[PDB]
């Protein structure tokens, strides 16, 4: 079977035929719970994908919505029964905000033309970035002739073995349902002309980066498999100074790296010894593969106060202003960085509204310090001092819980550089 090209291009006829064939076979191999959840996704994908975010950034004790928990599970199992045998290209038009890009791509002088300065800023923006795609993703099979008003056409390549199912109620515009857990990596940029109008066409690959989210089991194993050797090889003074930094001794150490300030009860000699010991420990086992880490950040790290009016993200204008100020910036970090590999909200910082989702590159000087039995349940990665990160994307969602603060919160996607 699977008589198709990798890229149907504009041939809607051949694509509809291939989709119809594999869809009826796919549907006749679903359990009843899966069939129901696919129908539920047809009817309200937006709520199911919004919920996937709410759940995975929620507290450990979050119960959530029963039927939607089954849906999250059942759509995954369903789509894994429809794995691509060969690469498939797919299409969708997109807004610039989905690439964390503020500047308008459409030229102000002719609206049919893509501004040349903007497309050049865009090529730099989408480089060296994995754009995490939250929830399930549904797309179509051909270049769509629809007179779109969005600036960007995404031309996405789904690798072999990708779970991508043929589904949908319009038998002449069937869709592709892609499993959760993927990211978009740009592989090309070009200006294309469709029905007289220039679009920024983003070629990209669908890739899967390591991101445990709520999977505490898979997280623990990875940290143990990769950093138990690291733990056994620590010097006594390194183990001690990490344990102390993590236990709370970080404030004075961080302050010294920030502005060279020495507390009245210590000395530069004591502060540098600690820093040298922690930093040397963090260079002993480089991050072995790209991984996503998380940090619930204080308002002060972006010039805001707990009671500052700009920190009310329940007002859409405050969200927008935050995106304008911070999207695309590089933030230097002179201190160590504590992050966790779980997306779960944390009781001790439950109300913080800025959630850093940090891409930690292969080769970074950082350690899963939670192999130390004291911090096992904290799932921490400690990052060496003096790195920077660039802000890639900012994404709002609503935390409905009362412990979380019944407030909007911002997911700040970033890349360590």
Coordinates of N, CA and C in Angstrom, one line a residue, residues 165-385:
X165 N -2.2 10.3 11.5 CA -3.4 9.5 11.1 C -4.2 10.3 10.2
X166 N -4.8 9.6 9.2 CA -5.8 10.2 8.3 C -7.2 10.2 8.9
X167 N -7.7 11.3 9.2 CA -9.0 11.5 9.9 C -9.7 12.7 9.4
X168 N -11.0 12.9 9.9 CA -11.7 14.1 9.5 C -13.1 13.7 8.9
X169 N -14.1 14.6 9.1 CA -15.4 14.4 8.6 C -15.7 14.9 7.2
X170 N -14.8 15.8 6.6 CA -15.0 16.2 5.2 C -14.1 15.3 4.3
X171 N -14.8 14.3 3.7 CA -14.1 13.3 2.9 C -13.4 13.9 1.7
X172 N -13.5 15.2 1.5 CA -12.7 15.9 0.4 C -11.7 16.8 1.0
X173 N -11.6 17.0 2.3 CA -10.5 17.7 2.9 C -10.2 16.9 4.2
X174 N -9.7 15.7 4.0 CA -9.2 14.9 5.2 C -8.0 15.6 5.8
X175 N -7.7 15.3 7.0 CA -6.6 15.9 7.7 C -5.6 14.9 8.2
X176 N -4.5 15.4 8.6 CA -3.4 14.5 9.3 C -3.3 14.9 10.7
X177 N -3.5 13.9 11.6 CA -3.4 14.1 13.0 C -2.1 13.6 13.6
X178 N -1.2 14.6 14.0 CA 0.1 14.3 14.5 C 0.1 14.2 16.0
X179 N 0.8 13.1 16.5 CA 1.0 12.9 17.9 C 1.6 14.0 18.7
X180 N 1.4 14.1 20.0 CA 2.0 15.1 20.8 C 3.5 14.8 21.0
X181 N 4.3 15.8 21.5 CA 5.7 15.6 21.9 C 6.7 16.0 20.9
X182 N 6.3 16.7 19.8 CA 7.2 17.0 18.7 C 7.6 18.5 18.7
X183 N 8.6 18.9 17.9 CA 9.1 20.2 17.7 C 9.4 20.5 16.3
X184 N 9.5 21.8 15.9 CA 9.7 22.2 14.5 C 11.1 22.8 14.4
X185 N 11.9 22.2 13.5 CA 13.3 22.7 13.2 C 13.3 23.2 11.7
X186 N 13.6 24.5 11.6 CA 13.6 25.1 10.2 C 14.8 24.5 9.4
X187 N 14.5 24.2 8.2 CA 15.5 23.7 7.2 C 15.6 24.6 6.0
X188 N 14.8 25.7 5.9 CA 14.9 26.6 4.7 C 13.9 27.7 4.8
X189 N 14.2 28.8 4.2 CA 13.3 29.9 4.1 C 13.3 30.4 2.7
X190 N 12.1 30.7 2.2 CA 12.0 31.3 0.9 C 10.7 32.1 0.7
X191 N 10.8 33.1 -0.2 CA 9.6 33.8 -0.6 C 9.0 33.1 -1.7
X192 N 7.7 32.6 -1.6 CA 6.9 32.0 -2.6 C 5.7 32.9 -2.9
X193 N 5.2 32.7 -4.2 CA 4.1 33.4 -4.7 C 2.9 32.4 -5.0
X194 N 1.8 32.6 -4.3 CA 0.6 31.8 -4.4 C -0.6 32.8 -4.7
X195 N -1.3 32.6 -5.8 CA -2.4 33.5 -6.2 C -2.0 35.0 -6.1
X196 N -0.8 35.3 -6.6 CA -0.4 36.7 -6.7 C 0.2 37.3 -5.5
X197 N 0.3 36.6 -4.3 CA 0.7 37.1 -3.1 C 2.0 36.4 -2.5
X198 N 2.9 37.2 -2.0 CA 4.1 36.6 -1.5 C 3.9 36.1 -0.1
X199 N 4.4 34.9 0.2 CA 4.4 34.3 1.5 C 5.8 33.9 1.9
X200 N 6.1 34.0 3.2 CA 7.3 33.5 3.7 C 7.2 32.0 3.9
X201 N 7.8 31.2 3.1 CA 7.7 29.7 3.2 C 8.8 29.1 4.1
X202 N 8.4 28.5 5.2 CA 9.3 27.9 6.2 C 9.4 26.4 5.9
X203 N 10.5 25.9 5.4 CA 10.7 24.4 5.3 C 11.1 24.0 6.7
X204 N 10.6 22.9 7.2 CA 11.0 22.5 8.6 C 10.9 21.0 8.7
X205 N 11.6 20.4 9.6 CA 11.5 19.0 10.0 C 10.8 18.9 11.3
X206 N 10.0 17.8 11.4 CA 9.4 17.5 12.7 C 10.4 16.6 13.4
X207 N 10.9 17.1 14.6 CA 11.9 16.4 15.4 C 11.3 16.2 16.8
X208 N 11.9 15.2 17.5 CA 11.5 14.9 18.8 C 12.7 15.1 19.8
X209 N 12.6 16.2 20.6 CA 13.6 16.4 21.6 C 13.2 15.8 22.9
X210 N 14.2 15.5 23.7 CA 14.0 14.9 25.1 C 13.3 15.9 25.9
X211 N 12.1 15.6 26.5 CA 11.3 16.5 27.3 C 10.4 15.6 28.1
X212 N 10.7 15.3 29.4 CA 9.9 14.4 30.1 C 8.6 14.9 30.6
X213 N 8.4 16.2 30.7 CA 7.1 16.8 31.1 C 6.7 16.3 32.5
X214 N 5.7 15.4 32.5 CA 5.3 14.8 33.8 C 5.8 13.4 34.1
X215 N 6.5 12.8 33.2 CA 7.0 11.4 33.3 C 8.1 11.4 34.3
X216 N 7.7 11.3 35.6 CA 8.7 11.2 36.7 C 9.6 10.0 36.5
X217 N 9.0 8.9 36.1 CA 9.8 7.6 35.9 C 10.9 7.8 34.9
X218 N 10.5 8.1 33.7 CA 11.5 8.3 32.6 C 12.6 9.3 33.0
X219 N 12.2 10.4 33.7 CA 13.1 11.4 34.2 C 14.1 10.8 35.1
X220 N 13.7 10.1 36.1 CA 14.6 9.5 37.1 C 15.6 8.6 36.5
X221 N 15.2 7.7 35.7 CA 16.1 6.8 34.9 C 17.2 7.5 34.2
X222 N 16.8 8.5 33.3 CA 17.7 9.2 32.5 C 18.8 9.9 33.4
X223 N 18.3 10.6 34.5 CA 19.2 11.3 35.4 C 20.2 10.3 36.1
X224 N 19.7 9.1 36.4 CA 20.5 8.1 37.0 C 21.5 7.5 36.0
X225 N 21.0 7.0 34.9 CA 21.8 6.4 33.9 C 22.9 7.3 33.4
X226 N 22.7 8.7 33.4 CA 23.7 9.6 32.9 C 24.5 10.3 33.9
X227 N 24.0 10.4 35.2 CA 24.8 11.2 36.1 C 25.1 10.5 37.4
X228 N 24.7 9.2 37.6 CA 25.2 8.4 38.7 C 26.7 8.3 38.6
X229 N 27.3 7.9 37.5 CA 28.8 8.0 37.3 C 29.4 9.3 37.7
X230 N 28.8 10.4 37.2 CA 29.1 11.8 37.6 C 29.2 12.0 39.1
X231 N 28.1 11.4 39.8 CA 28.1 11.6 41.3 C 29.2 10.9 42.0
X232 N 29.4 9.6 41.6 CA 30.5 8.8 42.2 C 31.9 9.4 42.0
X233 N 32.1 10.2 41.0 CA 33.4 10.8 40.6 C 33.6 12.2 41.2
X234 N 32.6 12.7 41.9 CA 32.8 14.0 42.6 C 33.8 14.0 43.7
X235 N 34.6 15.0 43.8 CA 35.4 15.2 45.0 C 34.6 15.6 46.2
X236 N 35.1 15.3 47.4 CA 34.4 15.5 48.6 C 34.0 17.0 48.7
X237 N 34.8 17.9 48.3 CA 34.5 19.3 48.5 C 33.5 19.7 47.4
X238 N 33.5 19.1 46.2 CA 32.5 19.4 45.2 C 31.1 18.8 45.7
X239 N 31.0 17.6 46.2 CA 29.8 17.1 46.7 C 29.2 18.0 47.8
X240 N 30.1 18.4 48.7 CA 29.6 19.2 49.8 C 29.1 20.5 49.3
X241 N 29.9 21.2 48.4 CA 29.5 22.5 48.0 C 28.2 22.5 47.1
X242 N 28.0 21.4 46.3 CA 26.7 21.3 45.6 C 25.6 21.1 46.6
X243 N 25.7 20.1 47.4 CA 24.6 19.9 48.4 C 24.3 21.2 49.2
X244 N 25.3 22.0 49.5 CA 25.0 23.2 50.2 C 24.3 24.2 49.4
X245 N 24.8 24.4 48.1 CA 24.2 25.3 47.2 C 22.7 25.0 47.0
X246 N 22.4 23.7 46.8 CA 21.1 23.3 46.5 C 20.1 23.4 47.7
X247 N 20.7 23.1 48.9 CA 20.0 23.2 50.1 C 19.6 24.6 50.5
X248 N 20.1 25.6 49.7 CA 19.7 27.0 50.0 C 20.8 28.0 50.1
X249 N 22.0 27.5 50.1 CA 23.2 28.4 50.2 C 23.5 29.2 48.9
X250 N 22.5 29.1 48.0 CA 22.7 29.7 46.7 C 22.6 31.3 46.7
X251 N 21.9 31.9 47.7 CA 21.6 33.3 47.6 C 22.9 34.1 47.6
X252 N 23.8 33.8 48.6 CA 25.0 34.6 48.7 C 26.0 34.4 47.6
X253 N 26.0 33.1 47.1 CA 26.9 32.7 46.0 C 26.4 33.4 44.7
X254 N 25.1 33.4 44.4 CA 24.6 34.0 43.3 C 24.8 35.5 43.3
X255 N 24.6 36.2 44.4 CA 24.8 37.6 44.6 C 26.3 38.0 44.2
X256 N 27.3 37.2 44.6 CA 28.7 37.5 44.3 C 29.0 37.5 42.8
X257 N 28.4 36.5 42.1 CA 28.7 36.4 40.7 C 28.0 37.5 40.0
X258 N 26.8 37.9 40.4 CA 26.0 39.0 39.8 C 26.8 40.3 39.9
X259 N 27.0 40.8 41.1 CA 27.7 42.1 41.3 C 28.9 42.1 42.2
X260 N 29.6 41.0 42.4 CA 30.8 41.0 43.2 C 30.6 41.4 44.7
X261 N 29.4 41.3 45.2 CA 29.1 41.7 46.6 C 29.5 40.6 47.6
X262 N 30.2 40.9 48.7 CA 30.6 40.0 49.7 C 29.8 40.2 51.0
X263 N 29.2 39.2 51.5 CA 28.5 39.3 52.8 C 29.4 39.6 53.9
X264 N 28.8 40.2 55.0 CA 29.6 40.6 56.1 C 30.1 39.4 56.9
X265 N 29.6 38.2 56.7 CA 30.0 37.0 57.5 C 30.8 36.1 56.7
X266 N 31.3 36.5 55.5 CA 32.1 35.6 54.7 C 33.2 36.5 54.0
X267 N 34.0 35.9 53.1 CA 35.1 36.5 52.5 C 35.1 36.1 51.0
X268 N 35.7 36.9 50.2 CA 35.9 36.6 48.8 C 36.5 35.2 48.6
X269 N 37.4 34.9 49.5 CA 38.1 33.6 49.5 C 37.1 32.5 49.7
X270 N 36.2 32.6 50.6 CA 35.2 31.5 50.9 C 34.2 31.5 49.7
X271 N 33.8 32.6 49.2 CA 32.9 32.6 48.1 C 33.4 32.1 46.8
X272 N 34.7 32.4 46.5 CA 35.3 31.9 45.3 C 35.6 30.4 45.3
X273 N 36.0 29.9 46.5 CA 36.2 28.5 46.7 C 35.0 27.7 46.4
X274 N 33.8 28.1 47.0 CA 32.5 27.5 46.7 C 32.2 27.6 45.2
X275 N 32.4 28.7 44.6 CA 32.0 28.9 43.2 C 32.9 28.0 42.3
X276 N 34.2 28.0 42.6 CA 35.2 27.2 41.8 C 34.8 25.7 42.0
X277 N 34.4 25.3 43.2 CA 34.1 23.9 43.4 C 32.8 23.5 42.6
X278 N 31.8 24.3 42.7 CA 30.5 24.0 42.0 C 30.8 24.0 40.5
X279 N 31.4 25.1 40.0 CA 31.7 25.2 38.6 C 32.5 24.0 38.1
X280 N 33.6 23.6 38.8 CA 34.4 22.5 38.3 C 33.5 21.2 38.3
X281 N 32.6 21.0 39.2 CA 31.8 19.9 39.2 C 30.8 19.9 38.0
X282 N 30.4 21.1 37.6 CA 29.4 21.2 36.5 C 30.1 21.0 35.1
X283 N 31.4 21.0 35.0 CA 32.1 20.8 33.8 C 32.6 19.3 33.6
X284 N 32.2 18.4 34.6 CA 32.7 17.1 34.6 C 31.9 16.1 33.7
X285 N 30.6 16.4 33.5 CA 29.8 15.6 32.6 C 28.8 16.4 31.8
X286 N 29.2 16.8 30.6 CA 28.4 17.6 29.7 C 27.1 17.0 29.4
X287 N 26.0 17.8 29.3 CA 24.7 17.3 28.9 C 24.8 16.4 27.7
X288 N 24.4 15.1 27.7 CA 24.7 14.2 26.6 C 23.8 14.3 25.4
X289 N 22.7 15.0 25.5 CA 21.8 15.2 24.4 C 20.9 16.4 24.7
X290 N 20.4 17.0 23.6 CA 19.5 18.2 23.8 C 18.3 17.8 24.8
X291 N 18.0 18.6 25.7 CA 17.0 18.3 26.7 C 16.3 19.6 27.1
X292 N 15.0 19.5 27.3 CA 14.2 20.7 27.8 C 14.1 20.7 29.3
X293 N 14.5 21.9 29.9 CA 14.3 22.0 31.3 C 13.4 23.2 31.6
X294 N 13.0 23.3 32.9 CA 12.0 24.3 33.3 C 12.5 25.0 34.5
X295 N 12.0 26.3 34.6 CA 12.2 27.1 35.8 C 11.1 28.0 36.0
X296 N 10.5 28.1 37.2 CA 9.5 29.0 37.6 C 10.2 30.3 38.1
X297 N 10.1 31.4 37.3 CA 11.0 32.5 37.6 C 10.2 33.6 38.3
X298 N 11.0 34.4 39.1 CA 10.6 35.5 39.8 C 10.3 36.7 38.9
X299 N 9.3 37.5 39.3 CA 8.9 38.7 38.5 C 10.1 39.6 38.3
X300 N 11.0 39.7 39.3 CA 12.1 40.6 39.3 C 13.1 40.4 38.1
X301 N 13.2 39.1 37.7 CA 14.1 38.8 36.6 C 13.7 39.5 35.3
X302 N 12.5 40.1 35.2 CA 12.1 40.8 34.1 C 11.5 42.2 34.5
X303 N 12.1 42.7 35.6 CA 11.7 44.1 36.0 C 10.3 44.3 36.4
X304 N 9.7 43.3 37.1 CA 8.3 43.4 37.5 C 8.2 43.0 39.0
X305 N 7.1 43.5 39.7 CA 6.9 43.2 41.1 C 5.6 42.4 41.2
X306 N 5.5 41.6 42.3 CA 4.4 40.8 42.5 C 3.1 41.6 42.4
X307 N 3.1 42.8 42.9 CA 1.9 43.7 42.8 C 2.0 44.8 41.7
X308 N 3.0 44.6 40.8 CA 3.1 45.6 39.7 C 1.9 45.4 38.7
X309 N 1.4 46.5 38.2 CA 0.2 46.3 37.3 C 0.6 45.6 36.0
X310 N 1.8 45.7 35.5 CA 2.2 45.0 34.3 C 2.3 43.4 34.4
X311 N 2.2 43.0 35.7 CA 2.4 41.6 36.0 C 1.0 40.9 36.0
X312 N -0.1 41.7 35.9 CA -1.4 41.1 35.7 C -1.6 40.6 34.3
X313 N -1.3 39.4 34.1 CA -1.4 38.8 32.7 C -2.9 38.4 32.4
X314 N -3.8 38.6 33.3 CA -5.2 38.4 33.0 C -5.7 39.5 32.1
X315 N -5.0 40.6 32.0 CA -5.2 41.7 31.0 C -4.4 41.4 29.7
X316 N -5.1 41.2 28.6 CA -4.4 40.9 27.3 C -3.4 41.9 27.0
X317 N -3.6 43.2 27.3 CA -2.6 44.2 27.0 C -1.2 44.0 27.7
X318 N -1.3 43.4 28.9 CA 0.0 43.2 29.7 C 0.7 42.0 29.0
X319 N 0.0 41.0 28.6 CA 0.7 39.9 27.8 C 1.4 40.4 26.6
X320 N 0.6 41.2 25.8 CA 1.2 41.8 24.6 C 2.4 42.6 24.8
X321 N 2.3 43.5 25.8 CA 3.5 44.3 26.1 C 4.7 43.5 26.5
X322 N 4.5 42.4 27.3 CA 5.6 41.5 27.7 C 6.2 40.9 26.4
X323 N 5.4 40.4 25.5 CA 6.0 39.8 24.3 C 6.8 40.8 23.4
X324 N 6.3 42.1 23.3 CA 7.0 43.1 22.6 C 8.4 43.4 23.3
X325 N 8.4 43.5 24.6 CA 9.6 43.8 25.3 C 10.7 42.7 25.2
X326 N 10.2 41.4 25.2 CA 11.2 40.3 25.5 C 11.4 39.4 24.4
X327 N 10.5 39.2 23.5 CA 10.7 38.3 22.3 C 11.9 38.6 21.6
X328 N 12.7 37.5 21.3 CA 14.0 37.7 20.5 C 15.2 38.2 21.3
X329 N 15.0 38.6 22.6 CA 16.2 39.1 23.3 C 17.1 38.0 23.8
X330 N 18.3 38.3 24.1 CA 19.3 37.5 24.7 C 19.5 38.0 26.1
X331 N 19.4 37.1 27.1 CA 19.5 37.5 28.5 C 20.8 36.8 29.1
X332 N 21.8 37.5 29.5 CA 23.0 36.9 30.1 C 22.7 36.4 31.5
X333 N 23.4 35.3 31.9 CA 23.2 34.7 33.2 C 24.5 34.5 33.9
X334 N 24.9 35.4 34.8 CA 26.2 35.4 35.4 C 26.3 34.4 36.5
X335 N 25.1 33.9 37.0 CA 25.0 33.0 38.1 C 24.8 31.6 37.6
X336 N 24.9 30.6 38.5 CA 24.4 29.3 38.2 C 22.9 29.4 37.9
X337 N 22.3 28.4 37.3 CA 20.9 28.3 36.9 C 20.4 27.0 37.4
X338 N 19.4 27.0 38.3 CA 18.7 25.8 38.8 C 17.5 25.7 37.9
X339 N 17.3 24.5 37.3 CA 16.2 24.2 36.5 C 15.7 22.8 36.9
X340 N 14.6 22.4 36.5 CA 14.1 21.0 36.7 C 13.7 20.4 35.4
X341 N 13.7 19.1 35.3 CA 13.4 18.5 34.0 C 11.9 18.2 33.9
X342 N 11.1 18.4 34.9 CA 9.6 18.3 34.9 C 8.9 19.6 34.7
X343 N 7.8 19.5 33.9 CA 7.0 20.7 33.7 C 6.1 21.0 34.8
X344 N 6.0 20.1 35.8 CA 5.0 20.3 36.8 C 5.2 21.6 37.6
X345 N 4.1 22.2 38.0 CA 4.2 23.4 38.9 C 4.7 22.8 40.2
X346 N 5.3 23.7 41.0 CA 6.0 23.4 42.3 C 5.4 24.1 43.4
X347 N 5.0 23.4 44.5 CA 4.3 24.0 45.6 C 5.0 25.3 46.1
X348 N 6.3 25.2 46.2 CA 7.1 26.4 46.7 C 7.1 27.6 45.8
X349 N 6.7 27.5 44.6 CA 6.6 28.6 43.7 C 5.3 28.6 42.9
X350 N 4.3 28.1 43.5 CA 3.1 27.9 42.8 C 2.4 29.0 42.1
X351 N 2.6 30.2 42.6 CA 2.0 31.4 42.0 C 2.8 32.1 41.0
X352 N 4.1 31.9 40.9 CA 4.9 32.6 39.9 C 4.3 32.4 38.5
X353 N 4.3 33.4 37.7 CA 3.6 33.5 36.4 C 4.5 33.4 35.2
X354 N 5.8 33.2 35.4 CA 6.7 33.2 34.3 C 7.4 31.8 34.4
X355 N 7.1 31.0 33.4 CA 7.7 29.6 33.3 C 8.7 29.6 32.2
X356 N 10.0 29.5 32.5 CA 11.0 29.3 31.5 C 11.0 27.9 31.0
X357 N 10.9 27.7 29.7 CA 11.0 26.3 29.1 C 12.3 26.4 28.3
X358 N 13.4 25.9 28.9 CA 14.8 26.2 28.4 C 15.3 25.0 27.6
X359 N 15.7 25.2 26.4 CA 16.4 24.2 25.6 C 17.8 24.1 26.0
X360 N 18.3 23.0 26.5 CA 19.6 22.9 27.1 C 20.5 22.0 26.1
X361 N 21.3 22.6 25.3 CA 22.0 21.9 24.2 C 23.0 20.8 24.7
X362 N 23.0 19.7 23.9 CA 24.1 18.7 24.0 C 25.4 19.5 24.1
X363 N 26.2 19.0 25.1 CA 27.5 19.6 25.4 C 27.5 20.7 26.4
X364 N 26.4 21.1 26.9 CA 26.3 22.2 28.0 C 26.9 21.6 29.3
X365 N 27.6 22.5 30.0 CA 28.2 22.2 31.3 C 27.1 22.3 32.3
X366 N 26.4 21.2 32.6 CA 25.3 21.2 33.5 C 25.2 19.7 34.0
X367 N 24.6 19.5 35.2 CA 24.5 18.2 35.7 C 23.1 17.9 36.3
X368 N 22.6 16.7 36.2 CA 21.5 16.3 36.9 C 21.9 16.0 38.4
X369 N 21.9 17.1 39.1 CA 22.3 17.0 40.5 C 21.3 16.1 41.4
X370 N 20.2 15.8 40.9 CA 19.2 15.0 41.7 C 19.5 13.5 41.7
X371 N 20.7 13.1 41.3 CA 21.2 11.7 41.6 C 21.5 11.6 43.0
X372 N 21.9 12.7 43.7 CA 22.2 12.8 45.1 C 20.8 12.5 45.8
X373 N 20.8 11.5 46.6 CA 19.6 10.9 47.2 C 18.7 11.9 47.9
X374 N 19.4 13.0 48.4 CA 18.7 14.1 49.1 C 17.7 14.8 48.2
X375 N 18.1 15.0 46.9 CA 17.3 15.8 46.0 C 16.6 15.0 44.9
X376 N 16.5 13.6 45.1 CA 15.9 12.8 44.1 C 14.5 13.3 43.7
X377 N 13.6 13.6 44.6 CA 12.3 14.1 44.3 C 12.3 15.5 43.8
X378 N 13.4 16.2 43.6 CA 13.4 17.6 43.1 C 13.8 17.7 41.6
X379 N 14.3 16.6 41.0 CA 14.5 16.5 39.6 C 15.3 17.6 38.9
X380 N 16.3 18.1 39.6 CA 17.0 19.3 39.2 C 18.2 19.1 38.3
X381 N 18.4 20.0 37.4 CA 19.6 20.2 36.6 C 20.2 21.5 37.0
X382 N 21.4 21.5 37.4 CA 22.2 22.7 37.8 C 23.1 23.1 36.6
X383 N 23.0 24.4 36.1 CA 23.7 24.8 35.0 C 24.8 25.7 35.4
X384 N 26.0 25.6 34.8 CA 27.2 26.4 35.2 C 26.9 27.8 34.9
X385 N 27.7 28.7 35.6 CA 27.5 30.1 35.5 C 28.1 30.7 34.2

